[PDB]
Fold this protein.
Amino acid sequence: MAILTLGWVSLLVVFTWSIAMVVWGRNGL
Amino acid sequence: MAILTLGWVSLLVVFTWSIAMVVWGRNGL
Amino acid sequence: MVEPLLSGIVLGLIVVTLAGLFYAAYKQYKRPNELGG
Amino acid sequence: MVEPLLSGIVLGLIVVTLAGLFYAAYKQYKRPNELGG
Amino acid sequence: YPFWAQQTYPETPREPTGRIVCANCHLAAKPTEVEVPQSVLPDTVFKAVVKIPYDTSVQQVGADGSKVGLNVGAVLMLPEGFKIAPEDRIPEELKEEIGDVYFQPYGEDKDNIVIVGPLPGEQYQEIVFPVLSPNPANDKNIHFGKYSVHVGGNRGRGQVYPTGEKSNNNLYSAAATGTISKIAKQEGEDGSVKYLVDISDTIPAGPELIVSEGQAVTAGDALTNNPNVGGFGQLDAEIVLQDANRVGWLIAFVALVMLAQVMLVLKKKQVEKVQAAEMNF
Amino acid sequence: YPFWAQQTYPETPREPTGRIVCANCHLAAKPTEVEVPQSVLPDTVFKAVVKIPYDTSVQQVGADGSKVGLNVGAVLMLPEGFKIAPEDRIPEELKEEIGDVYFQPYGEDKDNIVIVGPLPGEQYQEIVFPVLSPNPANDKNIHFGKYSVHVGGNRGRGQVYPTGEKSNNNLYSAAATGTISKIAKQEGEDGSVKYLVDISDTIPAGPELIVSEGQAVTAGDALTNNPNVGGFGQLDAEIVLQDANRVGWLIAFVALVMLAQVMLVLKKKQVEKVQAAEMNF
Amino acid sequence: MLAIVAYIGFLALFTGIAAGLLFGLRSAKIL
Amino acid sequence: MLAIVAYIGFLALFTGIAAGLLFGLRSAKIL
Amino acid sequence: ATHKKPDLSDPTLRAKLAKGMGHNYYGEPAWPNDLLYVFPIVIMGSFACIVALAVLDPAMTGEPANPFATPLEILPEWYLYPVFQILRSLPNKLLGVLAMASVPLGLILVPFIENVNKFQNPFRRPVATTVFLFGTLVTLWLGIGAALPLDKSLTLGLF
Amino acid sequence: ATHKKPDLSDPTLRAKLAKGMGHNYYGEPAWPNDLLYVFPIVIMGSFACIVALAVLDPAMTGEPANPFATPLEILPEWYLYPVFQILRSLPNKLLGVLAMASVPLGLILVPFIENVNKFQNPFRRPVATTVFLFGTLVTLWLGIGAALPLDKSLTLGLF
Amino acid sequence: DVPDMGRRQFMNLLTFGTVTGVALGALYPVVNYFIPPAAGGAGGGTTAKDELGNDVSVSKFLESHNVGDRTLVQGLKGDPTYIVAITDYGINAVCTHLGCVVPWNAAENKFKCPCHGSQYDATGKVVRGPAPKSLALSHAKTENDKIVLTSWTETDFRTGEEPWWS
Amino acid sequence: DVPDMGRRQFMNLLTFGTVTGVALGALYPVVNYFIPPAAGGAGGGTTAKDELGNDVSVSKFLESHNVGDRTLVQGLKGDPTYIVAITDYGINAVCTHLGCVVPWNAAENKFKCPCHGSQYDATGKVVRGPAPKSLALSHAKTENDKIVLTSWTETDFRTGEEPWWS
Amino acid sequence: ANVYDWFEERLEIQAIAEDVTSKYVPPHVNIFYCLGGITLVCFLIQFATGFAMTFYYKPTVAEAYSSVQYIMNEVNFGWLIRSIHRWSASMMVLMMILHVFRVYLTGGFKKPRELTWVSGVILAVITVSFGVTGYSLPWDQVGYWAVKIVSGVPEAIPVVGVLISDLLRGGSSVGQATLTRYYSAHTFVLPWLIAVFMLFHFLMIRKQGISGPL
Amino acid sequence: ANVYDWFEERLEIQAIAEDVTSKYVPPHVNIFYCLGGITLVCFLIQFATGFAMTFYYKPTVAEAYSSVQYIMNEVNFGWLIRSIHRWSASMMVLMMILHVFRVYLTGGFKKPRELTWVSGVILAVITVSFGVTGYSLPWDQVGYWAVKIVSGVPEAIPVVGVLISDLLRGGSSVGQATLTRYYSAHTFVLPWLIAVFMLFHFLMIRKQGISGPL
Amino acid sequence: MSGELLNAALLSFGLIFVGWALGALLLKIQGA
Amino acid sequence: MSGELLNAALLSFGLIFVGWALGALLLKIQGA
Ligand code: HEC
Ligand code: HEC
Ligand code: HEC
Ligand SMILES: CCCCCCCC
Ligand SMILES: CCCCCCCC
Ligand code: FES
């Protein structure tokens, strides 16, 4: 049942990472 | 049953007249 | 199903429109308008 | 029906976005950019 | 006959495919025409002409094998509510045009399905139907609109009896493969003329024998010709149950449109006058 | 009891409105909680905890009118395919957590509808259900997806018997309007304690008489208090029958998206280097 | 026959309307 | 607990990927 | 009639004329002479004719669909009569499909074929006009043929 | 980072700046820096989050509609919680309708009310910011109140 | 010689006035089209169906429901109407507060709405809850083994006032 | 120091290559979504219904249809299939020329299509008309008082060729 | 005050008016040059009436025919809206044909207007698709068999034929799925498609102006 | 030859490229200025998945619920398309709210951008209408009673209330007509309306540019 | 089905010329 | 219904700051 946890984790991570890449690409916001 | 005849006649007339008014308004075509 | 009224309208309008277009073309062919090229 | 996940996302994002906007506004208030009017 | 149609096919003379049941016994195809108004007003008597044309100088084969003139028959399937006009509602001229026609419904609660015939073909190549249109104003099941009309028209004797037995008005093929040696005549039961043909089979009078003295025929070849000179033909038509109010308002709207067009053109003329006077276009 | 629920309402413990039938006899409302996983894999044993909390130091009224501790009960409506896990499939720890619970189906072909209780309330305020999830791979009637779970939780003695007769665990109003003059005791049939009150009516032991020596009461006023300290509460939850493949492919897609984002940013960096070198932006 | 007269005069009528409105609005110093 | 590690290192992993691609493509005279 | 001659002293207009454009720079004013006054005449005329047809000859409602009974008559709308004819005349179904697809594709190819010359007038386009009249006559032939028995398709009930 | 200063010697730009426009004439190049490289990051991010939510928490299919059985719970979607609350709190239905209509109408009135000054920064707009925060808090209060019993609406289960 | 602004505006008024007339003439049938057609008046509406949309047989209905029994049927238009030894009037089950279907409680001799806690007596008049008005009534005229519900236009025998549903 | 066109194009290839990968990954489920789901395989498809969509009872069917009788049923997938003392094979009624349902004529011992005049014998092989192929066959295996039609994969006993419908 | 100046300062209406009044119509433009516009008019009619009928038509094998009858017999002016829809559909196709006659017989397809012609052909295919999909929505004999007799045509195509046919009829036979897909095509897909290509069409025409004199 | 020059000479791609590359992004534009765009993204998702579901969903009281179940259980990736539709609907409304937060807290609604704000409010009403109409299409308990409990609200309005309610639910009670009208609203009316007002929105933004720094 | 068809064709053909003639006449009585 | 809600709120609130921090870090290791 770890795959479920990794699923939700993947959601959180893609959210965090989207924000991070927008901040990086636009040079900080 | 003349009203039917006058109906079809009204179709023919509005067709003819549309053409006539376009010819008149655009000065002849 | 074949509709004679509609078919008649189609045929008639097609023929008269073609004839009209060739007439107009003939008019401009006979008397060329400005920039007629 | 009340959905706790969706509701949480709504509330959280609303609060953090409002706070973010006030932060940005505060930054420009402290340090006015060019044409800052 | 049409009453054989209503005998064998009681529910309806029209198959789900749209095919009229007369074609199950009348195997030859001849042209049938119809004349109905494009549109009719409610509670109005109008004329519906079923045309069943043929060559009167060309006669057919009677049951006994001799020539006879042929009779005409028809089935007229009208929209719901439509029915044969009451005689009190029929004008004298139309009465003159109709003649001695016996209009019958296909069954009860089927007044819109009329059967007619047999009639003397030499006097009834055109059958006139006095039809009364229904009225939506006093029947919630009747509405204004375009509806189908199904016509079946028939000439000459049929080919199949209701019992399933063939008639003499037929082409007779064969039975097996061999050599013809039975071209005689004579009878037994009734009168008329019969023919005995083996190679056993029997063919009635009427069809002309195209096989003479000793022929080496095969199974399927034609023993006789085809004496049939009649035929059946069906056709679809359309009729509009029209409302006078619709047409009236239509005429009004058309008049308004034409007036509006006139005003537009005249307005343009005024503007042309202004543009001629001024100079900013 | 829950078996009175399945006795009176055999088809289902859930009314079309979503109301659990226990509320027809248990008239007081107390909070009930549930703990189910957000999602489970197929053919997996998981835990479902029904919480029925109350004050243990507060005791209720027994049938004979004396104090007693109260028992807890519950009905758990699981999605189709779900059922109480086979004991061979239950881990030892979960076995320890469950205790002496007698899981019963509401009826045959209703294994997803489990009833439980009565249980000693002092030891079972949390009831643990060992549930086995179904598997779409070997049942065409089972599909992955989000489904409802309906929970009903109950404390203390009910108010209405299946026969329709009231219990002593009730508030007793009145009968008419006048003056109280019947505050006595005594009995006849069995033992216990009974009270005769007119103005005729009789009230059992349990409820405390709030009416003493000669009161001018009216029709509808309360003769006694409300001894009920229990109650019923229902709640809805949701569970996702999840497919591991869906999640795996999801993770892959997410990884690809993140990689793509990285490449886009790096590309922009390169372009920034070029724009720094050149000068046409 | 009826359709012919109805068509022709209508047409004739509305042409009368157009001309009458033309010379009418002209005489009314509008056109 | 598992969710925490999984979140942190992933994240840590992809940050390693981003930095490694940055300095990597830099050293490969592309960036 | 209001008219404006083309300003042949404007290089922008000349540049457009060289590219076959600029023909909206001269003539009668579009607004309001045509757009505001003449266009509504056309719109109202079209609408009135359509409405009149709709009232005098309303839409027909046939019989409910019957999957086990094929009607004696099966035809699409008129504008599909030619294609249909083709589809029911060619023994090879694939060839019929290709022929059907060839209509809009060939039409699409027309400008790239007739860009060999800049002539617009059909009387200066003898070959193109001939091909067009031929194709039109053939199209009408197929369309009329669609409503007839298959045995009389290449004849239309004539010779 | 690529940046372009505003050309304050261009009267067209100055004329736009005076009208509160022209703010797309300076700064970082839109193309390709933002449009081509950053926008797809946002699009893919949004899509990925939505897809992940869809997979991990799929749409639920309830029970068939029953016109004779009113469910114990009846709520619209979350974004209608405030209005709903209002609708179920006011005894006068007409007043509730008017209040409901007042939201987009008042919002529409906002620019014409705050055009009294050209300030954009909330810290230079104390009154407006105060009103906004108030309205937001009230909106959240109503929204949370919608999911609670009516008896605990003006309290939210607090005091 | 040249028409002034007054004449231009007047001509505009006439012309586009007529055109506007055409537009309205075209617009009337459309507007009426979107307005839903009448269901069918039979003295103010009749008949009463059940949950399957089938007509209710009185003889069969009374053999499935005892005395004092209340049962939802598809009354007027489609609204859930309470049928209550047949009763000469039917009670509308749609709440007056917001419109939830209110269930009946014989144990407390009153209708109790689960939405916001509105209560109606045995006849159906509001005694509690945020419900402002009383449940609507209908003439439950039984005939030819069918229940005919018609619009209650008589005096409300519960409040005395004219029916708020008119 | 400054990336040339080769490096820019290479970086473009990598970046937008990955993005393209994302797009394809998103596109696969959609494409598969629009492709209609499988009906349900039971040895190649089974069962046979009538015009009302009800399952055909063999015992009831044989008591309504005599010997040599031909009757259209909803065979495989929904196609009109001829049921012909039960026959071990069913004939597809959809024409091979263009797909009109061809009626049966016992008087001429053959199927005759009304559309363009195609003819098939008692078994259903083309003998006339523009129809290029023969009518499809299906295994009419009767069992548990129901007709089970399955896909004919054996040798066409009329032409000898492999079934054109495969 | 003055509201017009308010809307002018923001929308820049004056520029629009100048642009509109800067265009002229050359002498060679005759009445046939109306046909395209007339075609559009027909479509607009189709858009209106069509929309109207979505308020009563029901895309189910059980309900379709009955809903059409309901529109014709019970709905206020329903007969009118539907009949208008029929006739204006046929007229749209006819006027489109006549329009093609104009364009070809004036050589208006040549450089640089090739993309307008191509866009046009696409528009013709889309319009015919409207016709075909609509024709079968009443689910009467005519429409149903119009589908059945043409749904099997793409199967002639070697490798992707059966797939195409299945995608078109929503299965391997004509039924409810076919009706659903045809309705989606008819009231969602084709309106948007024809909107996009009409937009390209008109934008290109306005950009380039009408072709020159003959 | 060169195809690009061919398309360039006609479409004038160079002018488009110049116009696009003439725009710049000012320093004050931060991440919150993405929200509007994000909202659009959500809608595009709604447009795609929504369209997809019209190939299987059936707007009939008999078929609706079953068609939804069919989409969830039988259709390839149907569960995905529908779930995505749900979540992206909710996210569209949320992102729209956050976007309004941005606009108001940056004063971007003031002169001369009032019509962009008004257009925005209209867009919000339209979006919420999407939500309300879609919510009831499965014809489950939740959606059906969501309609029933709100369909009688406009009746509070004195003279035209009952008429409004009747127009909304297609009768004097909630039933099949209500579902039909809600489906037309949801898949025809609102998409076109929101297209028009989004168009005005975006055209006005592009015309005026983003508001100035704080 | 030839009568009504040919009639419709003939009418839709000639009414055009009737309208053309009427428009021309109006132009002549106008003085263009 | 308070646990999952508050959890979702907290996460959707703080992950923003985590991403902000990560982006800032990438910017610093970049050398912007
Ligand atoms: C992500 C980081 C961002 C940022 C910072 C911005 N956007 Fe958007 N954008 C989109 C559309 C349709 C418009 C209106 C039409 C148009 O302007 O051409 C905009 C507009 C803007 C602007 C103003 C532009 C100007 O000329 O001043 C700004 C400053 C802006 N946005 C910031 C569409 C999208 C989109 C998907 C379709 C996405 C993703 C974004 N935008 C993201 C962002
Ligand atoms: C096969 C070709 C073709 C088709 C089909 C076509 N167009 Fe056109 N159309 C053209 C071309 C090329 C022009 C420009 C010709 C010119 O500039 O002289 C044009 C011009 C027009 C015009 C302006 C001039 C005029 O003659 O009307 C309109 C309006 C128009 N089209 C609308 C439509 C609509 C609406 C449709 C279908 C729904 C359509 N067209 C279909 C090729 C086509
Ligand atoms: C109540 C107000 C409002 C609503 C609701 C609204 N808009 Fe906006 N939006 C604005 C205003 C005003 C601007 C311009 C502000 C500026 O220039 O700074 C804007 C800007 C935008 C922008 C560009 C800048 C940005 O911040 O994204 C986009 C894209 C956008 N809106 C899309 C949408 C979409 C899509 C919707 C709904 C479907 C929507 N908006 C709803 C008022 C609104
Ligand atoms: C058959 C009648 C034709 C009438 C034509 C009138 C115009 C030429
Ligand atoms: C309830 C868990 C909250 C975790 C928040 C982490 C980011 C602040
Ligand atoms: S379809 Fe059977 S013959 Fe043409």
Observations:
- Residues L 95, 97-98, 100, 102, 113, 115-116, 118, 129-131 surround FE2/S2 (inorganic) cluster (ligand 6) (CB under 6 Å).
